[PDB]
Design a protein around this nucleic acid. Sequence first.
DNA 1: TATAATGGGAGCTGTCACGGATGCA
DNA 2: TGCATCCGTGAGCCAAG
Lengths: 105, 1112, 170, 111, 14, 104, 221
Amino acid sequence: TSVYIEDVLHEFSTIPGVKEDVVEIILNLKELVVRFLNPSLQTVTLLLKAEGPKEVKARDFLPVADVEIMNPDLHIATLEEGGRLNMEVRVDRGVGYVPAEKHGI
Amino acid sequence: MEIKRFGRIREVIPLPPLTEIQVESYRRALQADVPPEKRENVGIQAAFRETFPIEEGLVLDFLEYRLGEPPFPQDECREKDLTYQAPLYARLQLIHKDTGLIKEDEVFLGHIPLMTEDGSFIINGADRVIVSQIHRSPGVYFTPDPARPGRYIASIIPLPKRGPWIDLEVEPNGVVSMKVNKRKFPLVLLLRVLGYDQETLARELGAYGELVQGLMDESVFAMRPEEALIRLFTLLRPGDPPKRDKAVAYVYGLIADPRRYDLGEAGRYKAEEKLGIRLSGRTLARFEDGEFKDEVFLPTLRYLFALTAGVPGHEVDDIDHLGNRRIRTVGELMTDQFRVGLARLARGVRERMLMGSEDSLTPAKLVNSRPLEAAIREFFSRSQLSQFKDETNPLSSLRHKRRISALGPGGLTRERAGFDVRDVHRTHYGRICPVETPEGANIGLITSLAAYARVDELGFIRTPYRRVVGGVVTDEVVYMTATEEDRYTIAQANTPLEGNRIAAERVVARRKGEPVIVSPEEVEFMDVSPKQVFSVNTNLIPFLEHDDANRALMGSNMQTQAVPLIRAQAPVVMTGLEERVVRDSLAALYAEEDGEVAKVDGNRIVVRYEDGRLVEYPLRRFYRSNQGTALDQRPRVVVGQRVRKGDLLADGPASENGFLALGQNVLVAIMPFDGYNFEDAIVISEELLKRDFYTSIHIERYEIEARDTKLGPERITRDIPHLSEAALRDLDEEGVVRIGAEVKPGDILVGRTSFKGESEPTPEERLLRSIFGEKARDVKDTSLRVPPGEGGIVVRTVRLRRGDPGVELKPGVREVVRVYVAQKRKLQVGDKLANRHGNKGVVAKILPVEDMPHLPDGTPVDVILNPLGVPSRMNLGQILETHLGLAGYFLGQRYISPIFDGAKEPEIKELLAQAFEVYFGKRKGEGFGVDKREVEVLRRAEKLGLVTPGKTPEEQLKELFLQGKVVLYDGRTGEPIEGPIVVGQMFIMKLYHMVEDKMHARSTGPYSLITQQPLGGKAQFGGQRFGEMEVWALEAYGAAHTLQEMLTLKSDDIEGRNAAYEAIIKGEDVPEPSVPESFRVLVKELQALALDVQTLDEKDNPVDIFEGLASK
Amino acid sequence: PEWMILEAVPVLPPDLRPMVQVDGGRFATSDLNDLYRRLINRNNRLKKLLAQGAPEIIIRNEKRMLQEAVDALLDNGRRGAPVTNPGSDRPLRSLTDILSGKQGRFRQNLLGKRVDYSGRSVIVVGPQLKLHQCGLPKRMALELFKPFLLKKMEEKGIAPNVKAARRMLE
Amino acid sequence: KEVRKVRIALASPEKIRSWSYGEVEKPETINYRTLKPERDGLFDERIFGPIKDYECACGKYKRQRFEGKVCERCGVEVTKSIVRRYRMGHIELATPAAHIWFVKDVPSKIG
Amino acid sequence: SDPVRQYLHEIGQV
Amino acid sequence: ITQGLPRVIELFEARRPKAKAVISEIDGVVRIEETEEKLSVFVESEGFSKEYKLPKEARLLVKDGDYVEAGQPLTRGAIDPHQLLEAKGPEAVERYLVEEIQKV
Amino acid sequence: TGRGLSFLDLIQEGNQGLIRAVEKFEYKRRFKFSTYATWWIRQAINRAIADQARTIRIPVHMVETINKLSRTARQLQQELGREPTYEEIAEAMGPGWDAKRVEETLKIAQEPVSLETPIGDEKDSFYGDFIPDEHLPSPVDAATQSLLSEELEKALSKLSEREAMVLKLRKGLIDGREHTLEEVGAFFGVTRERIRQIENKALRKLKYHESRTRKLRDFLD
DNA sequence: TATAATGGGAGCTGTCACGGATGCA
DNA sequence: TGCATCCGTGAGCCAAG
Ligand SMILES: Nc1ccn([C@@H]2O[C@H](COP(=O)(O)CP(=O)(O)OP(=O)(O)O)[C@@H](O)[C@H]2O)c(=O)n1
Ligand SMILES: [Mg+2]
Ligand SMILES: [Mg+2]
Ligand SMILES: [Zn+2]
């Protein structure tokens, strides 16, 4: 439900060394399936650091306990020589389809 | 995917380079890669040669010109609101006749704008496109006299602005009249002035029946040539002294002056072919050895007499033949304005040559460039033919560039636009597309260049044909004019060929348009392709042959209006054109030689070529097109990829792997849906928004100036009086909004203070101020806020100040600030969708997915189009497009069905069968029988005669699938739709007409200076227009009071509107109106016309509606 | 009958032919002013040419030019060439022009007007309405009825006064 | 008094002058530096009226206290500025001139 | 008709 | 095959139509007199005789020696409303105009 | 021609110069008449072109300066291959000329533009049909002045009729103008210190009411 | 304030239908 | 009295521009 990328100010950006643009990256992160093992848990903030020639998939997120990434193969970004990514993507519980223009998280 | 491709016709030649009509023409007019001395006397060289030399004593001649390099590159001009252009220098020299002194100098004439690679310009920062003009070719014509059946009019027509129209009529009185500058006189006189003599005219024109006697006027041959010339001069300049040198001057300027009269190279050639003569220059006569020698007048006269007698080999001219109508491309249009500015410069030359030191005169001191700089600036900025570039999507730009208008300077006025002009003349075949043109007043006046068509040196439109000799179809392709084309029998591109020979006893051909069945013995040529008949847009329409022309027009034009989507898809059913279009439009980037790809970035792609070099292609990313759609390129290779010359490196906007992606492939069901798709409205599934289909990115530009005022300076400041830090959160120290912020209507984007003026405080102000102990500040809040119903994310700020380097603003301006605001636009209720067969409609309802009709395997349809849209409209193409799209949904393939050479029904049914097996044998294996609901629908299908009685559920379902129809469940209930329904993949686009741009409301707001009525239009926060016909509506209802509100309280009754606003905010019923102000304006404007308008009471005693204020 | 001949030529009140500064501080102005300026210069040069006793040829020329100035002011284009402002092809807009036509005072501002409390947007079927209803976007309504909303906002608690409520929807 | 008819008649020179608030003697509009109306020109406040509500041109009179008052120092009445839409000027011709409506509207009424 | 031709003629008299 | 909008405008504007029908000014009786090269129709009253010269190929609606009312049509074609008015009076034009407009 | 006056206007101003030359000619110098006449004819044409050609009239010496500026800039462009900046023009202009002066002179030389300038390429639009009238109060503005007046009187009523009337006299709500303390004191028959003091207490009580009710704040901005 | 200088230039064009005033035989 | 010819006037609404 929300993404912070370092050195990124808003959704309409590029990151040097990354093939994808922020718009595509969030389009990818939309797909990401996150299983909450603990039932009382409402929100998690996955951290990610990555760099160097590397096709960052979803596995590359820092593990958190009581949290399982069900599609780790899911591609996220393509990085080339000296391209750095550093994200904090927040995953919430909720019901229905709630568009960004309506929760502003 | 695999791309199955249909078609039998093989296409000898590719589509010619699609912006050649622009790029070539400008090149030709500039001759800028040509070394000076090697230039031809065309384009701006020809303009120079026409103006110079300039005489009178002092002579100023012209050697050569040169065009330097652009002071700034294209991107830079686009940002700095500049003009991409080149410096213009001309080496000129002064000569004194007597003295022989020759002082020489390269003088600078200002700048000329340069055409960009893709064929457009950049004027004061905005891309513009110069549209080609269509007009009547210069030449000599014979048209029938419409009053007098057996008589005809010769018309001698020059280029626009390079001569007068001349008519030659045979009067009912026998004498042959020439009409010139609207004066009819006996042609005999001019014939005399030419050195002609009743001997020569008698022997030349005696043949023709009794006509030549109407040319015999003895009172004319009585005079020597000079006496005749002076008779004519008095006849054409009544009163002007018939001085000898003066009359020779006037007549020469009328008929022989090559710097005043000009047929085209076209007017020349056309007359040459028509009258069977040869011209010397480009005028009607010459001055040789002291006298006037004829070139065109007698040939035209002989042709006229022969047409009137009945001599074989003479006919009138179809003035709408595309052999008698030619195109003025960008170079010709710009050159004409060049010619003009030069003439004005020449007047300034002669002026300064008359007075001032006639020894200390250089070319620089004689040449004011400004006439020419002004003429050019005019032609690019305020011409009718200089249009704001339509770069909605790449295809829109391309199509714009290939437009043809009949309008504009020197063209038809909308009042002079009859039928025949707008007709689809037979010779439009292969040249002008008979479909792409607007519905409305401009029907048939704005047209599109056909796809294979080309414009030749003379300006005529040519189209290509294969040569056919003894039934062999060569690969020798001839481009013809229509005068050429009219000579041959030409078979149709689809006629069947074994090998290279015509394998048909009877073949379909044209002679002079006329359709004709002929033997391959008679076949002299054959069409290149069906593609050759239509415009690019029309060519982008699969199954075009199944669509009535009226809706194909709408599919054609509407493609122009497709918004580039963030997830654009090439259509599941293409025409083959979709790739070349992305290429020629410069959408994408391609590999310039074979190479290995070094680097790949959001912003750049670096390629290592076979010469060991390194090219760094930078990507345009999230730039704002003329219409605010996002022009943005994405990298489509990755580090290490080996790429051949011409391999795709970056997809443009509306490009998917180098294919034109104007929309999405959605899953349609064609059925009514509870009125929500009434009268062309469309239902969509929320899934489309969820997975971000039909989402587009737009950027608005916001500008502000802080200037120097009589009353002090405006300044861009964070320190804006009377605002809370609430109002200021997102403003950097200098008052400009912060990149990143979300900005909503009412938000400040750029702060600004302006000084208050003679704000003599009203006593209420003084007392209120005292009560509150706050001085009213010097300045006031004039910041640039967000207009109603606009907003988004700030993505760049540009700031230019006075005193900053490189920067100089218009006088008085202290600083300019621009703020760009981007927005992701989801599809919403009231946005417009269209398909390529003219099916168009607004989105009327977005159901959640569980209400959407679904297939039995649980899959919801994406879009529900009402069938009632089909029969009246007769565009069956979309139907076929859906059936094919059904198959490619389950086989997992796209398709290429060329127009008139496409997938036929039985092949589509082959494919549907393969699909059905994929769609149903799946279910059989997974262990499920035919559902009970499917049995019910099958029963209903059996009564409808759509399946055969007796076969099995699988047999019958396959029978339906072959007809494009599938069992469909109503997700509301789970009961099945009583019949099987047409469901498949359709290519549907989101046109530029989004409701976010259109919705608008006004309580009260700005009024106008003289009328005190409300301004008009969203941008001005204006009021709707309640016109004469709306007034009639109210009159015919008898809503006198509602009517009277519109005429008074709701506009331009000042007292009444102020009073009404106060009453409504105080809960008081609204006052009675008083006199509308614009009536007081009428009274006064009549007074200004010396008319006394006088309001009276029943006693016939004046009433003052100016409440005293106008009487003494 | 003589009143069909002009001695005193009236002049329209300036607000009906303004000289306005626009956003940029530049000046825009209506053509009548250049028509009157033509007129007044020619009239004045005539009063002087009379004082200084000029020949007939010259006085006659001036008088002709004076009549044509009046002609352009009143019905430019009617007789002869229409007066253009320098270096343009556009005729100047005269009082007759202001009056007459699809664009003139009557048809353009008197038999029909722009109006307040009015809006425009795209339409959409809405098959749920009953015959007597229409769906109206909220934001449209808020602006269309804005004064009523300021009032009702004050009647309830939603703002102290009209001016505050109006600040609250900005 | 309620409006019931609307009459329209030819205008006599004396009626045109009766409407007028001053002959416009000069072709000037506004001063290129002050941006104020020139005297005896097409925008003079002396003829057509005050530009600002109840404030004369030079400055001496600036409130509604003085209504109808004509300033001695600058000649501008102190009324509502609205009158600048309503107060006719006039011009006096050295030779009388034809009203083209009554000349070129055929059949010419004069002819 | 053309008020300049008119004056060029009247000039052409003296 | 229709006339459409222009015919309506030809009527509301009360225009003498191009292809007008010649109508009898008066009552009378028909005497046809057709040379191989010229043609004319005479309407003869008890002591008044009117002659109507019309081109050779124009259709008639009068068999010879018939009794016709003032303003009846002799040619096929559209009646000049003004001639109908002068011949037959306002009620006749009113009928004519209303019926023709409604035909369109 | 071209310079802002019709051919005929030029001719007539030239005839004015002809009259001047005649009354000032001296045949004894033995010159033909044309030689002397051309000086005055030129002078009269040029004085007309300077005096009349601008809808905003510019003194002739200023017009001369503006033309000098035009021509200097043209020279500078003819040698610079581009347009001159304000600084280059000031340099070539001499001393006494800086960039700010060139810019003010340009600003002053700006000629106005027609309110009937065509917008679009139909016949149904006018520039300045987009120019909103800033002068006449808006209906909000006007309603807001009425609500102010009414709420100021509402506050003043909570004073004694003398303190209310004294404040009304002093600020101008009565007769337009402000009164001196000596005037209000002669009208109410007190000392000017006394009327200053009752004014002070009137304002004290109005400030107290506006603390306790908040009924005047929003109008102030 | 003085050599002599002595009559202009750009037209610009693919309608059409009507009504009502001038122009002729 | 009858025609041909000539000049002037008109040619849909709203929207954005
Ligand atoms: N220039 C214009 C353009 C549009 N309009 C108006 O908009 C409508 C377009 O109809 P339309 O032909 O586009 C469709 P519709 O009428 O529903 O029939 P169909 O669907 O079976 O094809 C017209 O009927 C007019 O009311 C106008 O007055 N002038
Ligand atoms: Mg993208
Ligand atoms: Mg300097
Ligand atoms: Zn004063």
